Amino acid sequence: MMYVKLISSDGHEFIVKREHALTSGTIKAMLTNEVNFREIPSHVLSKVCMYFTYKVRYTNSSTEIPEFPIAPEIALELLMAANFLDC
Amino acid sequence: RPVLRSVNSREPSQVIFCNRSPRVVLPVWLNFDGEPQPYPTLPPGTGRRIHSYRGHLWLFRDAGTHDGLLVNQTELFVPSLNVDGQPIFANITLPVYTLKERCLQVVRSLVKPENYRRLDIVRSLYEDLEDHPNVQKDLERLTQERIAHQR
Amino acid sequence: MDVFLMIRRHKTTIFTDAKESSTVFELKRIVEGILKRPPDEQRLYKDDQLLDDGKTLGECGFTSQTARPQAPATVGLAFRADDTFEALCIEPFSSPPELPDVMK
Amino acid sequence: LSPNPPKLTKQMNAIIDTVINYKDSSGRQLSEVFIQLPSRKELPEYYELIRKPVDFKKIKERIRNHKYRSLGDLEKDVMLLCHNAQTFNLEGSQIYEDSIVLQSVFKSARQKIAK
Numbered sequence: 001m002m003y004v005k006l007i008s009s010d011g012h013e014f015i016v017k018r019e020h021a022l023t024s025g026t027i028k029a030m031l032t033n034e035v036n037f038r039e040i041p042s043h044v045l046s047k048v049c050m051y052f053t054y055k056v057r058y059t060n061s062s063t064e065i066p067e068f069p070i071a072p073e074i075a076l077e078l079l080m081a082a083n084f085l086d087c
Numbered sequence: 088r089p090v091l092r093s094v095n096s097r098e099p100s101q102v103i104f105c106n107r108s109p110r111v112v113l114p115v116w117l118n119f120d121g122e123p124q125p126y127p128t129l130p131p132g133t134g135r136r137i138h139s140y141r142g143h144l145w146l147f148r149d150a151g152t153h154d155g156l157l158v159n160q161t162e163l164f165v166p167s168l169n170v171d172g173q174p175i176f177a178n179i180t181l182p183v184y185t186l187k188e189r190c191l192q193v194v195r196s197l198v199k200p201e202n203y204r205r206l207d208i209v210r211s212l213y214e215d216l217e218d219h220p221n222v223q224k225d226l227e228r229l230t231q232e233r234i235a236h237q238r
Numbered sequence: 239m240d241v242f243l244m245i246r247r248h249k250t251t252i253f254t255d256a257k258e259s260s261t262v263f264e265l266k267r268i269v270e271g272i273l274k275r276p277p278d279e280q281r282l283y284k285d286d287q288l289l290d291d292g293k294t295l296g297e298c299g300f301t302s303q304t305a306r307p308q309a310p311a312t313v314g315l316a317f318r319a320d321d322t323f324e325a326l327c328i329e330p331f332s333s334p335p336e337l338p339d340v341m342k
Numbered sequence: 343l344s345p346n347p348p349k350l351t352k353q354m355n356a357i358i359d360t361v362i363n364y365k366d367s368s369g370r371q372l373s374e375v376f377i378q379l380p381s382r383k384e385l386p387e388y389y390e391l392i393r394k395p396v397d398f399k400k401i402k403e404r405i406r407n408h409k410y411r412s413l414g415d416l417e418k419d420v421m422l423l424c425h426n427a428q429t430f431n432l433e434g435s436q437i438y439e440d441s442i443v444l445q446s447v448f449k450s451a452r453q454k455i456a457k
């Protein structure tokens with residue numbers, strides 16, 4: 001029931017469970033319950049938050065694992081974000 | 088001589104290779120010298136009864152990209168004894184990849200390897216894209232993990 | 239089974255999950271624990287259709303096939319200013335750049 | 343190389359065709375595993391224990407190229423194939439029991455040709 005707030009470069013606020021946000025080693029290091037991302041835009045940060053949910057829901061579970069989808073137009077910025085966030 | 092190899096047994100083993108992943112699966116048998124031998128592929132969401140032997144070693148990959156897949160929640164599969172007309176199940180599934188590895192997969196599928204250097208990304212990510220999923224490098228790591236585990 | 243959602247109002251997005259059998263009011267109680275506004279001061283929308291407190295998330299059209307962890311379904315949220323309800327406003331996210339030549 | 347009389351080749355192919363096509367009561371073709379030997383690259387221990395390896399593909403190849411000069415020479419190689427099957431594999435294994443039946447099928451098929 002503990003939540004954290006992740007802010008995108010354009011000012012979007014993403015409220016996610018603290019457990020889910022700890023998926024990122026960088027966020028885990030920075031944590032406090034708020035982190036601002038000066039170089040991650042909302043369209044990438046929302047996708048990163050979808051990954052945190054996906055990882056936590058399916059890590060060590062037998063309820064068939066689906067593919068994590070990535071549209072071609074977001075792939076490059078999402079790769080840059082994944083590398084910076086360490087997840 | 089290589090630790091990861093099939094046992095030269097003669098007791099047959101009927102196994103069901105069940106592909107519960109969205110990928111086209113390449114089954115890979117490690118021969119008696121631990122060399123990986125590719126076998127016929129498995130379409131997504133299908134099961135096939137195959138003839139193998141006790142102590143034989145298998146791993147499973149994406150037939151197109153060689154991305155590593157899981158079998159019974161792990162990396163290697165070994166058929167056991169058929170307990171009174173009962174085929175063994177090798178449950179092939181999609182791992183939960185890291186967001187970084189999943190992104191590298193998607194960028195590799197979209198860009199030719201000769202063009203990786205033309206992408207506007209940091210220097211270290213070019214090396215990451217070029218470090219393609221490889222069965223031999225994964226066998227080198229699994230051999231090192233076994234050497235550590237038993238110490 | 240579980241439904242995975244994005245509760246959206248202005249530039250705020252809450253990632254939460256709930257049971258398909260749970261109600262619209264139980265979801266307003268989750269919003270109360272985070273945004274500190276009681277359920278009576280909230281209106282919830284699937285696209286632009288207002289949702290009833292006693293209706294389940296399943297009955298609203300949020301199911302495990304349409305509300306997945308990797309692709310959550312959006313729930314619009316509007317609050318009550320004084321005694322009148324504000325018009326539903328969800329600010330969009332940014333747009334990705336144009337696809338590079340080598341990716342096309 | 344010297345060509346065999348057509349009647350002897352006709353007999354040799356009829357005997358081996360009976361052996362190769364033979365099916366059990368469950369419809370299973372018993373010669374299947376015996377058609378091709380596994381390569382020495384994939385199973386070298388077979389070639390270490392079996393001094394003179396032979397499979398049915400080689401026997402058909404020996405009839406066609408007139409290597410066997412009599413029905414006794416064909417029988418010698420079929421009995422060698424079955425003897426090798428019984429040497430490499432253990433008693434009770436399906437392959438060991440399949441080789442004995444094919445051996446008996448060869449002998450009845452040959453006795454049919456003898457009238």
Ligand SMILES: Cc1ncsc1-c1ccc([C@H](CCCN2CCC(c3ccc4c(c3)n(C3CCCC3)c3nc(=O)c5c(Br)cccc5n43)CC2)NC(=O)[C@@H]2C[C@@H](O)CN2C(=O)[C@@H](NC(=O)C2(F)CC2)C(C)(C)C)cc1
Nearest residue numbers: 126127137138139140143375376378379384397423426427
């Ligand atoms: C469809 C699909 N979709 C996704 S994956 C897939 C799929 C497709 C095809 C298959 C085939 C399926 C065919 C299996 N079959 C291969 C040939 C083998 C063979 C063939 C001829 C033999 C013989 C054994 N043996 C014996 C029986 C056991 C020991 C050797 C024997 N003894 C004789 O004496 C003999 C003679 Br007189 C004449 C001619 C042949 C003879 N043969 C029997 C099993 N299966 C295999 O290839 C399996 C898998 C892996 O475990 C290795 N493997 C083997 O069979 C190995 N064999 C052995 O280790 C041993 F034989 C005990 C020593 C090798 C060395 C041949 C590679 C499976 C999955």
